[PDB]
Amino acid sequence: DVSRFLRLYLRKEGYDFHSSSEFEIVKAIKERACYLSINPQKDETLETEKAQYYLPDGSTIEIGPSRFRAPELLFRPDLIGEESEGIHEVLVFAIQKSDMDLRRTLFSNIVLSGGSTLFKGFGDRLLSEVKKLAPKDVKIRISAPQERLYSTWIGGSILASLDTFKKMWVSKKEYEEDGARSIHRKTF
Amino acid sequence: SDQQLDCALDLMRRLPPQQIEKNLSDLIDLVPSLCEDLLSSVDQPLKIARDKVVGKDYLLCDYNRDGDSYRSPWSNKYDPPLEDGAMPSARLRKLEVEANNAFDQYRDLYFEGGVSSVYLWDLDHGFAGVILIKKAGDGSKKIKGCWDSIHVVEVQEKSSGRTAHYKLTSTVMLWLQTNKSGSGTMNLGGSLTRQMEKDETVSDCSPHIANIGRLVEDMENKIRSTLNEIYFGKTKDIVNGLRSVQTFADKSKQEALKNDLVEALKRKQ
Amino acid sequence: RVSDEEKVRIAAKFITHAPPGEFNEVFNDVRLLLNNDNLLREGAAHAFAQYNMDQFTPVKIEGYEDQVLITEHGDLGNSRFLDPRNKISFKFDHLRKEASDPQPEEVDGSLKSWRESCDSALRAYVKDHYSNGFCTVYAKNIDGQQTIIACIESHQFQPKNFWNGRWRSEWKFTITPPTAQVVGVLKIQVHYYEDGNVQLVSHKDVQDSVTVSNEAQTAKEFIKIIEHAENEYQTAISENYQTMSDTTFKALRRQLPVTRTKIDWNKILSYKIGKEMQ
Amino acid sequence: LLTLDILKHGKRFHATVSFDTDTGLKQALETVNDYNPLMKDFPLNDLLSATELDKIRQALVAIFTHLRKIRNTKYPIQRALRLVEAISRDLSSQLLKVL
């Protein structure tokens, strides 16, 4: 969706990309030409260096302001026009809707994963946002391993390689006996 | 001397729950011929033992009191060294070690520490066990508490088909203190006991132990709840009913208008 | 086998811990048990004297309809507590719970002005905040010091509702004129046993002072310190009861686990949660 | 063992641990070893060529005294009863030809 909103901003820049096999080029631009501004507004009130971009075709696109406001969507889904929340609010609400006896432990252990957590200045902006929402003088700690793209897979490799996985799965026989209810029963 | 026993039980009933052990020993020191007649219905705290070979803890009651030894469920050994005790069924020994495991999980989830134990024994068409849980307050903290729980459970398994009849009897022997500045010292004793019985279907996903776990969980939730609201609120009501904070003749005004509205409500009947 | 002299300490231990409003029942369960009324006669008689001198026992005065309190701080031996109100001496059967000999006590005169002064102010106070309260003020020239031992007691003995409770309150109005370090104690014992057993035992070691300025000023000012500490203490106790589901009990046993969900017994028993992995 | 080393060196612990746990060979061998002295040197031949009843008397006592070592090897109930009936089967066969 960040790529989609980036496509909209590229149209507003003047460059049009609307083919389905061109939306992928928009993803490539998101993966190698966007960053996250620390100050969300102070940087918007300035004219950046407007770095270029080489298409597979061989053309040239000067982006400009459409590179930091594009992943800004994750922290404010008002730009897409939606009453949802940012990432920081998802973390703070996920922590605050828990037992009050575990908040400090959760703030001291935050792990990022997923490819969208690879933007430049992502973790730093997340720290700033969480500090603005967490209570005062609570150690906030965001970890960010080097395998955020492979976090869920490596975790699957560790989990399924254990002897308890034999008792943790659902056998085919069981599925033929009970059905889908067996899966919802043993969903964890 | 049967009336003497009835008055003795009522004396323990009204005895202060701070010195249950000492005063129970004193009452036994009166008529020691009635001693192990009282140690069956007089609730007292538990005794912590120490499994030497495993490095765990296990509580003491009459069900683990094999002869005059105690069957440590972490080792299935008797302490004092009685090599003539009544070992449980090997089947029930495996069921008991998983029982101790599940209740360690239970204890860790609600009590966040504390000591627990689950012993077992037979029945013709089932089996029966006891569940001991003893949580002393945080010694580092000033709250000197001591949660004590005993759960007499009797699994009356039916014929076949894996449906049972789970009879359960519980007991909670609370203990509390706070050295708060607003209250000085606020000691708070207390004890409960309930019974419940359900016939939950047994299955490969629903073993007996899981049914017992749900019953013990629900029972303790009800007891802790019931205590906190009913009994403790009742004590707060008693202290408020004794002495009121509002000055009298002001309460006469509010009670005056209260009786006025009493007449108003019972006026349009 | 246990001797007879230890039975005195046993009966003393059972009477000195009897809850309010339940003394007679402890007496029945100790009379039908110790089997020797002579042993408990002497030993338990001293225990009765203690249990009735310490807990500010409500004693009825048939002559003036006052229902004075027997406080430890006043006696002349054979249950001869000196009633400060009406200046009458009296005997009292600790068991019959009926006083005797309302002889007009020829008090030596210690702080009788302060006695009825602070007593009067405390009568007003009791009639203000105590429903079934009782005041009694002991005036004494204790060890070369003039003091007022104002005592407050309220209770409710409702056996049909399976509960009791006896607000007891003492205020040593130390008449140390330049600095009356009014230090007393407000002990409370509440019992409730409907389908169970619950006992509340508390006390606040109140410590406060004021210069003995005048008599009426320190009488109502003594009431000011009293109303302060008592409103404070009762309110604070109520809020301790308010913050108990989440703090005290959570020190003992949480209502719900830290995961805020029930227990999937099927999960724990079926497989190990991953506790083996760290 | 070389195949097992391949699966261990290739970080695949499944077949390696299951080669000893999923196979009930370990528990089968331990029960086998529990019954191993009990099955070696069994005096059934004393019952085979016994036509005289006195030979059968001493033979029966000998076989049961050798069978007395089932106190230390956990012998089952119904298994022992069918065992006894098997002993009586051969006793009957011997007596049939004896008559």
* Structure tokens that stand for D85 in this block: 């009936």
Contacts of B10 in chain C (CB under 8 A): 25, 29
B134 and B223 housed in the same domain: yes
Single-letter amino acid code for the residue at B117: S
* Structure tokens that stand for B143 in this block: 């709250």
A1 and A57 housed in the same domain: yes
Q: Is A18 strand, coil or helix? A: coil
Judged by a CB distance cut-off of 8 A, whether residue D17 touches chain A is yes
In residues, how long is chain D? 99
In this structure, the strands spanning A110-111 and A142-143 are parallel
Closest approach of B86 to chain C, Cα-based (Å) = 27
Nearest alpha-carbon partner for C185 in C223, C136, C156, C152: C152
Taking the C-alpha atoms of residue B265 and residue B259, their distance in angstroms, rounded to an integer, is: 10
Selected residues 173-212 of chain C with any CB under 8 Å from a CB in chain B = 188, 190-194, 196-205
Nearest alpha-carbon partner for B120 in B63, B180, B158: B63
Single-letter amino acid code for the residue at B208: H
Taking the C-alpha atoms of residue B203 and residue B198, their distance in angstroms, rounded to an integer, is: 15
Residue ending a domain, among B56, B88, B120, is B88
Q: Identify whether the C-beta of residue B177 lies closer than 8 Å to the C-beta of residue B143.
A: yes
- Whether chain D lies against chain C with 3 or more Cβ pairs closer than 8 A is no
> What residues make up the domain containing B120?
89-269
B158 and B209 housed in the same domain: yes
Judged by a CB distance cut-off of 8 A, whether residue D14 touches chain A is yes
CB within 8 Å of D46: residues ≥ 6 apart: D55, D58, D59, D62, D63
A50 and A69 housed in the same domain: yes
Q: Identify whether the C-beta of residue B142 lies closer than 8 Å to the C-beta of residue B119.
A: no
Judged by a CB distance cut-off of 8 A, whether residue C58 touches chain B is no
Provide long-range contacts, Cβ within 8 A and 24+ apart, for A92-98. Answer: A92/A130, A92/A133, A92/A134, A98/C260
Contacts of C230 in chain B (CB under 8 A): 243
* Structure tokens that stand for A96 in this block: 């605050």
* Structure tokens that stand for A132 in this block: 């603005």
Closest approach of C267 to chain A, Cα-based (Å) = 7
A35 and A57 housed in the same domain: yes
What are the beta bridge partners of residue C251?
none
The CATH number assigned to the domain holding A126 equals 3.30.420.40
* Structure tokens that stand for B62 in this block: 């009459």
| Beta carbons of D17 and A161 less than 8 Å apart | no
> What residues make up the domain containing A116?
85-151
Q: How many CB atoms lie within 10 A of CB B212?
A: 24
Q: What is the resolution of this structure in A?
A: 3.4
Taking the C-alpha atoms of residue B11 and residue B24, their distance in angstroms, rounded to an integer, is: 10
Taking the C-alpha atoms of residue C181 and residue C178, their distance in angstroms, rounded to an integer, is: 9
Domains of chain C in start order, with CATH, are 1-107 (3.30.1140.60), 108-252 (3.90.1150.210)
Q: Write down the residue that tokens 């009590």 correspond to.
A: B111
Single-letter amino acid code for the residue at C277: M
B54 and B180 housed in the same domain: no
The CATH number assigned to the domain holding B163 equals 3.90.1150.210
Contacts of A162 in chain C (CB under 8 A): 276-277
B117 and B46 housed in the same domain: no
Helix, strand, coil percentages in chain A from 3-state DSSP, rounded to 5? 50, 5, 45
Q: Identify whether the C-beta of residue C21 lies closer than 8 Å to the C-beta of residue C164.
A: yes
| Beta carbons of B220 and C253 less than 8 Å apart | yes
Nearest alpha-carbon partner for A61 in A32, A23, A31, A29: A29
Residue ending a domain, among B53, B88, B123, is B88
| Technique used | cryo-EM
A52 and A10 housed in the same domain: yes
Q: Write down the residue that tokens 């594009």 correspond to.
A: A70
Q: What are phi and psi of A45, to 5 degrees?
A: -85, 20
Phi-psi domain of C101 (left: phi exceeds 0; alpha: psi -120 through 50; beta: other): left
Give the chain B residue whose CA is nearest to the CA of C10.
B26
| Beta carbons of C276 and A101 less than 8 Å apart | no
Judged by a CB distance cut-off of 8 A, whether residue B266 touches chain C is no
Q: How many CB atoms lie within 10 A of CB A175?
A: 13
Mapping DSSP onto H, E and C, the string for chain C reads CCCCHHHHHHHHHHHCCCCCCCHHHHHHHHHHHHCCCCHHHHHHHHHHHHHHHHCCEECCCCCCCCCCEECCCCCCCCCCEEECHHHEEEEEECCCCEEECCCCCCCCCCCHHHHHHHHHHHHHHHHHHECCCEEEEEEECHHHCEEEEEEEEEECCEHHHCECCEEEEEEEEEECCCCEEEEEECCEEEEECCCCEEEEEEECCCEEEECCCCCHHHHHHHHHHHHHHHHHHHHHHHHHHHCCCCCHHHHHCCCCCCCCCCCCHHHHHHCCCCCCCC
Q: Is A150 strand, coil or helix? A: coil
| Beta carbons of B238 and C13 less than 8 Å apart | no
| Beta carbons of B186 and C165 less than 8 Å apart | no
- Whether chain C lies against chain B with 3 or more Cβ pairs closer than 8 A is yes
User: Which parts of A82-188 are beta strand (E)?
Assistant: 110-111, 142-143
How many domains, chain B?
Answer: 2
B129 and B242 housed in the same domain: yes
B156 and B263 housed in the same domain: yes
Taking the C-alpha atoms of residue B202 and residue B166, their distance in angstroms, rounded to an integer, is: 11
* Structure tokens that stand for B90 in this block: 């090997």
What are the beta bridge partners of residue B258?
none
Residue ending a domain, among B43, B67, B88, is B88
Subunits with 3+ Cβ pairs within 8 Å of A are C, D
Provide long-range contacts, Cβ within 8 A and 24+ apart, for B141-144. Answer: B141/C251, B142/B178, B142/B179, B143/B176, B143/B177, B143/B178, B143/C247, B143/C248, B143/C251, B143/C252, B144/B175, B144/B176, B144/B177
B14 and B103 housed in the same domain: no
B51 and B117 housed in the same domain: no
Give the chain B residue whose CA is nearest to the CA of C163.
B238
Q: Identify whether the C-beta of residue B212 lies closer than 8 Å to the C-beta of residue B198.
A: no
A77 and A96 housed in the same domain: no
Taking the C-alpha atoms of residue B252 and residue B259, their distance in angstroms, rounded to an integer, is: 10
The CATH number assigned to the domain holding A72 equals 3.90.640.10
Verify cis geometry, omega within 30 degrees of 0, for the bond prior to B80.
yes
Query: Residue-wise over C241-274: b if at least 16 C-beta within 10 A, else e?
Result: beebbeebbbbbbbeebbeeeebebbbbbbbbee
What are the beta bridge partners of residue B191?
B173, C197
Taking the C-alpha atoms of residue B154 and residue C88, their distance in angstroms, rounded to an integer, is: 66
A34 and A16 housed in the same domain: yes
B196 and B109 housed in the same domain: yes
B106 and B71 housed in the same domain: no
Q: Is A101 strand, coil or helix? A: helix
Contacts of D13 in chain A (CB under 8 A): 161
Interface with chain A: mutation pick from D7, D8, D14, D19, highest number of A CBs within 10 Å? D14
A9 and A74 housed in the same domain: yes
Taking the C-alpha atoms of residue D9 and residue D13, their distance in angstroms, rounded to an integer, is: 9
Spell out which chain C residues touch chain A, with contact meaning CB-CB distance below 8 angstroms.
250, 258-260, 264, 266-267, 270-272, 274, 276-277
A39 and A59 housed in the same domain: yes
Phi-psi domain of A123 (left: phi exceeds 0; alpha: psi -120 through 50; beta: other): alpha
For helices A2-13 and A23-33, what crossing angle results, to 10°? Answer: 100
Q: How far is CA D40 from CA B85, B156, C41, D34, D49, in A?
A: 35, 46, 83, 12, 19
Q: How many CB atoms lie within 10 A of CB D55?
A: 14
Q: Write down the residue that tokens 């606020």 correspond to.
A: B186
A65 and A104 housed in the same domain: no
Selected residues 79-98 of chain B with any CB under 8 Å from a CB in chain C = 98
- Whether chain B lies against chain D with 3 or more Cβ pairs closer than 8 A is no
Helix, strand, coil percentages in chain D from 3-state DSSP, rounded to 5? 75, 0, 25
Subunits with 3+ Cβ pairs within 8 Å of C are A, B
Subunits with 3+ Cβ pairs within 8 Å of D are A
Spell out which chain A residues touch chain D, with contact meaning CB-CB distance below 8 angstroms.
161, 163
Interface with chain B: mutation pick from C8, C23, C29, highest number of B CBs within 10 Å? C29
Torsional sign, CA A33, A39, A40, A43: negative
For helices C23-34 and C39-54, what crossing angle results, to 10°? Answer: 170
* Structure tokens that stand for B99 in this block: 């029982």
Mapping DSSP onto H, E and C, the string for chain B reads CHHHHHHHHHHHHCCCCCCHHHHHHHHHHHCHHHHHHHCCCCCCCCEECCECCCCECCEECCCCEECCEEEECCCCEEECCCCCCCCCCHHHHHHHHHHHHHHHHHHHHHCCCCEEEEEEEEECCEEEEEEEEEEECCCCCCCCCEEEEEEEEEEECCCCCCECCEEEEEEEECCECCCCCCCEEEEECCEEEEEEEECCECCCCCCHHHHHHHHHHHHHHHHHHHHHHHHHHHHHHHHHHHECCCCCCCHHHHHHHHHHHHHHHCCCC
Subunits with 3+ Cβ pairs within 8 Å of B are C
